[PDB]
Amino acid sequence: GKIQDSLSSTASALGKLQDVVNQNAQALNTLVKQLSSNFGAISSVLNDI
Amino acid sequence: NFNFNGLTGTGVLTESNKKFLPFQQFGRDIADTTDAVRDPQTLEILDIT
């Protein structure tokens, strides 16, 4: 019962899994956003340039 | 391949229940990629996939 209550009332108990998920999500977001960079081109869109 | 008011993209347009604002025209997501468009011809919102 005590461990159940601690898990219910504590938000940092599952820090490891949430941190791993957040790291993966932010890595994916950074990879997606890297496309926005033009690297000297007029626009990042291949068709437009 | 949809060209809406100069915004060019490729995807499937489907009816959307999203509620835009009168001044709002385009849509975006967490990864700043186009997700919804308000057609100028008629007052409705179309998603992109």
Side-chain angles (χ1 to χ4, degrees), chain B:
Chain B
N1 190 350
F2 55 90
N3 186 358
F4 277 98
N5 299 308
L7 173 76
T8 69
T10 306
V12 174
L13 318 180
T14 70
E15 286 287 358
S16 67
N17 60 336
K18 290 190 172 189
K19 310 309 302 186
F20 269 40
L21 300 182
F23 68 97
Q24 300 170 334
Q25 278 187 348
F26 300 164
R28 279 191 192 279
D29 63 336
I30 312 310
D32 73 7
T33 58
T34 310
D35 192 20
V37 163
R38 187 197 271 291
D39 50 347
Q41 197 191 352
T42 178
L43 278 295
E44 60 181 341
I45 308 94
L46 310 157
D47 291 339
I48 286 152
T49 306

Side-chain angles (χ1 to χ4, degrees), chain A residues 20-35, chain B residues 29-33:
Chain A
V20 165
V21 174
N22 297 355
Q23 199 169 2
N24 286 320
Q26 63 84 30
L28 298 179
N29 285 141
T30 311
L31 182 70
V32 170
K33 285 186 177 163
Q34 276 293 101
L35 295 164
Chain B
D29 63 336
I30 312 310
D32 73 7
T33 58

Side-chain angles (χ1 to χ4, degrees), chain A residues 13 16 20 23 25 33 37 42-45 47-49:
Chain A
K16 303 270 187 66
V20 165
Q23 199 169 2
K33 285 186 177 163
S37 49
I42 303 298
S43 297
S44 54
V45 181
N47 305 331
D48 174 72
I49 192 68

